[PDB]
Amino acid sequence: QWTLEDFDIGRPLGKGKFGNVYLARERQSKFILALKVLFKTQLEKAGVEHQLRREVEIQSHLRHPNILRLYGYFHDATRVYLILEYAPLGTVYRELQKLSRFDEQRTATYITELANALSYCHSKRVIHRDIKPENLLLGSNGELKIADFGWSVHAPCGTLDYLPPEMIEGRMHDEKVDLWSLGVLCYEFLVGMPPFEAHTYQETYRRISRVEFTFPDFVTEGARDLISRLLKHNASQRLTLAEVLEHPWIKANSS
Numbered sequence: 001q002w003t004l005e006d007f008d009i010g011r012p013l014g015k016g017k018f019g020n021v022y023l024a025r026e027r028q029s030k031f032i033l034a035l036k037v038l039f040k041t042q043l044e045k046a047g048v049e050h051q052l053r054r055e056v057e058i059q060s061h062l063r064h065p066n067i068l069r070l071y072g073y074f075h076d077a078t079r080v081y082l083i084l085e086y087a088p089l090g091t092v093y094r095e096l097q098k099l100s101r102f103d104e105q106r107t108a109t110y111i112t113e114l115a116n117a118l119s120y121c122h123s124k125r126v127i128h129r130d131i132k133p134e135n136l137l138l139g140s141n142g143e144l145k146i147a148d149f150g151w152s153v154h155a156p157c158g159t160l161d162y163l164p165p166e167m168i169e170g171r172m173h174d175e176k177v178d179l180w181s182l183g184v185l186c187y188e189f190l191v192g193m194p195p196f197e198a199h200t201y202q203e204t205y206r207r208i209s210r211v212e213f214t215f216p217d218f219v220t221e222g223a224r225d226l227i228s229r230l231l232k233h234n235a236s237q238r239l240t241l242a243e244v245l246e247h248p249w250i251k252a253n254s255s
């Protein structure tokens with residue numbers, strides 16, 4: 001039954017649309033964690049109070065080294081606080097801006113670690129639906145840790161960039177949506193920008209719908225194959241996580 005007075009609030013770890021993330025310390029144990037501060041008025045305004053309660057429920061069951069822990073939550077009067085595992089090496093979004101693009105060795109490792117986290121998620125029938133660089137964090141030893149199960153549902157906001165055709169059209173969708181997103185991620189890791197980037201929402205809609213993307217000259221055939229086999233309009237055709245993990249290019253470049 002946590003209260004704010006139990007925690008030493010430290011430095012900001014990031015700013016979000018719904019609230020801010022701060023580094024924190026549990027006064028008794030001296031344990032280092034992260035506290036995301038959400039406003040209650042903001043949550044009730046967009047009608048997502050149930051989604052947050054669903055996220056906490058989903059995260060109370062999941063345990064995996066490539067999934068950022070959510071320990072529980074508390075509120076006072078005006079704000080809601082999420083007790084979170086701290087990811088010392090920040091976001092992948094930030095690492096991507098810092099390095100422009102990743103090499104194949106780093107990319108494959110991230111895809112391998114993501115696939116594992118998704119494999120564990122999909123087996124428990126949990127679909128993430130929001131796989132993007134800003135929702136991927138890096139642990140002490142540089143491992144990928146997936147976070148933000150707010151838009152997660154059971155089997156079967158920002159830009160549209162990572163959302164599959166079935167999701168952007170407002171149709172039915174299963175575990176295969178995390179596979180399209182994984183494909184999109186793999187492309188942005190190597191290229192530096194997502195395959196369907198546009199200056200307008202409406203153009204991005206056209207690109208995703210018709211699956212209109214190209215590869216720059218530096219992308220290898222092994223990466224070209226993987227991404228192409230993932231980015232398919234037909235959800236039931238897309239490669240499985242097991243095939244992704246056993247993919248020649250993935251096996252070659254992964255650690």
Ligand SMILES: Cn1ncc2ncnc(NCCc3cnc(NC(=O)Nc4cccc(C(F)(F)F)c4)s3)c21
Pocket residue numbers: 013014018021034036038043048049051052053055068082084085086087088089090091137147148149150151
């Ligand atoms: C930036 N950063 N740098 C280091 C670092 N280390 C640990 N954590 C960080 N950041 C927080 C990561 C999150 C994990 N889970 C989240 N969950 C969430 O934000 N849920 C959520 C929010 C608003 C609205 C809704 C609702 F209701 F709409 F569903 C749901 S955010 C870190």
